[PDB]
């Protein structure tokens, strides 16, 4: 859990001569610093 997620497909490698080029995508780790929660009350009737 140092990173959130990453798609394996995006890991592409180009090799040519003495040079190696690599592309990737990573979803950075994050930490919660806000919580918003909504509550709703409702009537109920029970029978039998």
């Amino acid at each position: 859990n140092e990173i959130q997620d990453f798609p394996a497909e995006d890991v592409q490698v180009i090799v040519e001569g003495n040079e190696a080029r690599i592309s990737m995508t990573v979803y950075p780790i994050r930490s919660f610093k806000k919580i918003s929660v909504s509550l709703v009350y409702k009537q109920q009737t029970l029978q039998a």
């Binding site: 009537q43 009737t45 029970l46 029978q47 039998a48």
Partner: protein
């Protein structure tokens, strides 16, 4: 109350049974002098709004109705909860005409013609 003819009012037969059942259900148990068991515990059953308290009420009411000797049996019909308000209804089978006839005609041997139940 008065009967309108300057004499004390009287309830008979089914009216009498209504009166006695209402009075027993309304009376708290143990409050009546000389009669610890007469009454009902409904004054304490003003609990939460869940099926459990409904069942407690129902069981207490069935106990209170069964306590009467004349009530042959009682049973739940239907109940519901509307938040604050609880609502329920019961069915009471008093002793049949044949049994009452047999009892009264048997009482002729003694001549009391009165009820000390």
């Amino acid at each position: 109350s008065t009967n309108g003819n300057g004499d004390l009012d009287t309830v008979k037969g089914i009216d009498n049974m209504k009166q006695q059942l209402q009075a027993r259900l309304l009376t708290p148990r143990g409050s009546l002098m000389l009669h610890p068991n007469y009454g009902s515990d409904l004054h304490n059953l003003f609990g939460l709004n869940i099926p459990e308290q409904a069942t407690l009420i129902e069981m207490e009411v069935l106990r209170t109705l069964t306590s009467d000797n004349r009530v042959k049996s009682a049973n739940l019909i239907d109940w519901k909860i509307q938040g604050n308000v609880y609502s329920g209804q019961f069915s009471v089978e008093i002793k049949s005409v044949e049994e009452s006839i047999n009892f009264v005609l048997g009482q002729d041997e003694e001549g009391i013609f009165a009820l000390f139940e």
